[PDB]
Amino acid sequence: SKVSVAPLHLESAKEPPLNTYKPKEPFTATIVSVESLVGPKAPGETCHIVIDHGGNVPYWEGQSYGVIPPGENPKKPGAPQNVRLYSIASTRYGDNFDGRTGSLCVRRAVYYDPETGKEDPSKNGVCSNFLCNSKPGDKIQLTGPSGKIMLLPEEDPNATHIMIATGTGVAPFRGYLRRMFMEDVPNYRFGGLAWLFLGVANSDSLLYDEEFTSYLKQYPDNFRYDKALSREQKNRSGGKMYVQDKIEEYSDEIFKLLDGGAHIYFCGLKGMMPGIQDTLKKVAERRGESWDQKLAQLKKNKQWHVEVY
Numbered sequence: 001s002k003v004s005v006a007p008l009h010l011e012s013a014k015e016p017p018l019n020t021y022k023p024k025e026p027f028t029a030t031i032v033s034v035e036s037l038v039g040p041k042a043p044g045e046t047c048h049i050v051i052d053h054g055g056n057v058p059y060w061e062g063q064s065y066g067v068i069p070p071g072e073n074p075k076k077p078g079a080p081q082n083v084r085l086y087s088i089a090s091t092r093y094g095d096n097f098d099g100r101t102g103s104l105c106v107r108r109a110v111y112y113d114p115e116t117g118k119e120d121p122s123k124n125g126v127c128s129n130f131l132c133n134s135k136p137g138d139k140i141q142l143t144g145p146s147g148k149i150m151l152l153p154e155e156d157p158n159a160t161h162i163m164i165a166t167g168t169g170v171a172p173f174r175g176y177l178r179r180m181f182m183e184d185v186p187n188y189r190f191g192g193l194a195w196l197f198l199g200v201a202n203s204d205s206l207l208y209d210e211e212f213t214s215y216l217k218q219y220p221d222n223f224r225y226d227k228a229l230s231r232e233q234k235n236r237s238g239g240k241m242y243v244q245d246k247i248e249e250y251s252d253e254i255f256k257l258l259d260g261g262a263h264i265y266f267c268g269l270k271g272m273m274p275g276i277q278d279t280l281k282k283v284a285e286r287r288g289e290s291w292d293q294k295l296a297q298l299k300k301n302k303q304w305h306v307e308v309y
């Protein structure tokens with residue numbers, strides 16, 4: 001049974017909030033918790049950050065928060081750092097089910113000399129390390145929310161949603177899936193098919209795996225979940241197993257769902273897309289279809305949702 005969430009007045013707004021806080025006057029939020037999401041064999045750290053916004057910075061699932069890390073802009077003396085955007089990984093109610101917190105899924109950007117491996121603090125990512133280094137009680141300059149590309153289409157509560165993530169691109173889908181399956185939201189009762197595909201480097205790099213696996217047991221007729229591990233698995237051609245390769249294992253089912261009106265979403269680092277497009281083109285060709293024409297139709301019908309970075 002679904003978890004009680006409050007306050008239900010978060011369902012009343014008819015439009016998503018946008019730019020509630022702007023960079024010149026951010027909202028000063030407070031860190032609740034920071035935890036690593038990954039095990040010792042992961043190539044780098046990805047963290048889950050819970051942020052208390054006090055109900056002052058509400059959002060809809062699929063939106064992003066901006067964070068302004070501390071310090072001066074190196075390219076602009078006397079001026080703050082540029083905003084960095086992070087897909088919100090929580091529902092509008094947040095991980096405490098109270099409408100006061102939101103969560104981020106943050107990959108630490110670390111520099112290594114391509115020959116020696118030697119680090120250099122001046123070359124680390126500023127905001128990602130700032131966030132993953134944070135501790136309860138620390139203050140965060142929050143902006144936004146922003147973005148509409150990844151809003152969840154709720155007009156059809158029995159729609160099909162095919163969610164394609166790599167790494168931190170899982171973030172919006174954690175929010176979608178909690179709203180679909182975990183939370184007691186009386187005005188959104190999902191009875192369609194949600195299908196999550198997740199590509200990461202290895203088993204230790206999985207993100208929220210226990211949560212997603214539990215949906216298989218709770219909603220076996222409404223949720224599917226497939227994973228790819230690039231460094232621990234190979235595709236049928238004997239390249240590294242990427243999220244495009246798991247899609248190909250379900251070629252027929254996927255194309256049938258798209259033809260029936262399914263939404264398909266892509267999120268994560270933009271390098272994921274070339275290989276996905278290559279696979280989809282080849283799958284279409286094997287079926288005797290033109291991927292160009294299919295993609296044009298999916299775009300025209302508003303079924304195709306991409307937020308990569």
Ligand SMILES: Cc1cc2nc3c(=O)[nH]c(=O)nc-3n(C[C@H](O)[C@H](O)[C@H](O)COP(=O)(O)OP(=O)(O)OC[C@H]3O[C@@H](n4cnc5c(N)ncnc54)[C@H](O)[C@@H]3O)c2cc1C
Nearest residue numbers: 084085086087105106107109123124125126127128168309
């Ligand atoms: C819509 C959207 C959603 C996003 N969602 C997420 C998300 O959920 N999770 C997430 O982790 N990220 C996400 N991102 C990316 C995020 O916004 C940041 O770009 C990212 O976290 C890195 O920012 P940073 O401040 O750490 O790096 P920056 O300080 O901006 O540095 C960028 C890169 O340059 C490198 N670098 C800096 N100086 C040098 C140098 N001299 N030589 C070589 N390399 C150098 C850094 O190591 C880093 O790898 C999203 C982006 C967008 C647009």
